[PDB]
Specification:
With about 100 residues, this protein is α+β, with helices and mostly antiparallel strands. The protein has helices at about 35-45, 45-55, 65-80; strands at about 5, 10-15, 25-30, 90-100. It has a single domain, classed as 2-Layer Sandwich (Tetrahydropterin Synthase, Chain A), CATH 3.30.479. The longest helix has 16 residues, at about 65-80.
Amino acid sequence: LGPLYAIDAPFAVNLVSQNGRRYLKASISLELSNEKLLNEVKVKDTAIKDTIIEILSSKSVEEVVTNKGKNKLKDEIKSHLNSFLIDGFIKNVFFTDFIIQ
C-alpha cells in the first residue's frame, strides 16, 4: 500500500458526442508505487494533467458509463502516465467524483 495522491483540481472535458454536447467531470487520485515518486508527480503535474485530459476527452458517453469502460479508462491512465514516469509508477487510479452532463 503506497502513498495515495489526490489531484486537487477536478477534471472537466468534452466527451465525443456526434449528436449533442456532453461533459465529463471527474476527481482522480493516483496510488503511487513508492515515496520517491511523490516529488516527481508534483514536478510533473502539468504533464500528468495533459495526459489525463487527452484520455478522458477522447472517449464517448457509451465508453465510460459501464464499469468495463471505467476500468478501461483507469488502465489507459495508468499506462500512459507510466510511459514517462521514472522514479516509480502508478499502482492504481481511483475516482472520487465521476459524472456526465
